[PDB]
Swiss-Prot record, chains A, B:
Belongs to the glycosyl hydrolase 2 family. The chain holds residues 413 to 618 of 1024 of the full protein. Induction: By allolactose. This is Beta-galactosidase. One of its GO terms (biological process) is lactose catabolic process. The lineage of its organism: Bacteria, Pseudomonadati, Pseudomonadota, Gammaproteobacteria, Enterobacterales. Mg(2+) 1 binds at E5, H7, E50. Mg(2+) 2 binds at N186.
Length: 206, 206
């Protein structure tokens, strides 16, 4: 996945729809493909994450398809089924319940496969957000994956908690999150979404 | 719907795959279209019912598409998604549960829409078999019809009970079914599948 995320912009594609940022973005895609294209374990390219859908995404998708046709390209931004992706790759689409947001609806995974015109496979780029005591309903996804042939799985969010070690007054280490370093504004415990603790001890959800 | 049903044959398409019965079958389709093609209420032609899938079905489908392109043609036999139908029109396919028979599987209606290559609308030619105290789970179909755009409804089985009136020794009429006339073999109360009684009084399922 290329090092492109512009989630903080308003709207999300304010840079990725702008031709003056097309050189910057193109360097982040083309230099990744040139470095990693010989690795057999790499089977899919990604254009980045949470950057809306802009014209630069469509351009860089067509660049990768020209230079390396041996790997599908995917990209979630702008509703997860745009022309910049070969795979329908939504984040946190539910199995049976639709989430009808305005421009970017998250349809039920089962419903999304049958919308008129849609023919692509569906692989969730993020699902089953494992923040703390979580992964309720995980069996519902896997029942759906096995039953539906075009539901080909997904990628859980995520592997390891992003906590940092701080030390108390007696030098005992403790796991810290968000505003524990004086950083403000911050987003508190939301960095810790892992199936494993930061020392790689498993959570019960694993 | 043309007057063609060969459900009792083994296999079901023993006549409809046979060219020596193609003249007979062709008269039952072509004379129906010639009689009824001016009626605006007729919006879909049907090739008959429960006759497997034979080559004669594909021939008569292409005849109707040539002579009258203003109406889609459907036909359920041979698995409800053959080349003889413009609409996926299964009988008694369930909303979420698959029924994997050997040559003619009845997939879940939601799953059937997304199978690879499938692009047609889905309208059940028969569903919610109203035999007696029935129509349990009817709301599940209609939730699915409203949520899925390519699920465009279906036709309930069926309208009126097929019972006949007999009279007792004091002349009191009573509703009769299957073997009540000495007919043997017979299939008993299976003729009565209606939402209404034979005198058009409604059942509670209506
Ligand atoms: Na699958
Ligand atoms: Na997070
Ligand atoms: Na619909
Ligand atoms: Na019946």
């Amino acid at each position: 996945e290329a090092n492109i995320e512009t989630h903080g912009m308003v709207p999300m594609n304010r840079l990725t729809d702008d031709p003056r940022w097309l050189p910057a973005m193109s360097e982040r895609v083309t230099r990744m493909v040139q470095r990693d294209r010989n690795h057999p374990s790499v089977i899919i390219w990604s254009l980045g994450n949470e950057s809306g859908h802009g014209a630069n995404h469509d351009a860089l998708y067509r660049w990768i398809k020209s230079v390396d046709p041996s790997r599908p390209v995917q990209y979630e931004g702008g509703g997860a089924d745009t022309t910049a992706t070969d795979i329908i790759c939504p984040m946190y689409a539910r199995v049976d319940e639709d989430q009808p947001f305005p421009a970017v609806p998250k349809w039920s995974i089962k419903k999304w496969l049958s919308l008129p015109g849609e023919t692509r496979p569906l692989i969730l780029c993020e699902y089953a957000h494992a923040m703390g005591n979580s992964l309720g309903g995980f069996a519902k996804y896997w029942q759906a994956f096995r039953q539906y042939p075009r539901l080909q799985g997904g990628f859980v969010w995520d592997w390891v908690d992003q906590s940092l070690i701080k030390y108390d007054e007696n030098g005992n280490p403790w796991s810290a999150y968000g505003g524990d370093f004086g950083d403000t504004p911050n987003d508190r415990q939301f960095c810790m979404n892992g199936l494993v603790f930061a020392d790689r001890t498993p959570h019960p959800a694993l």
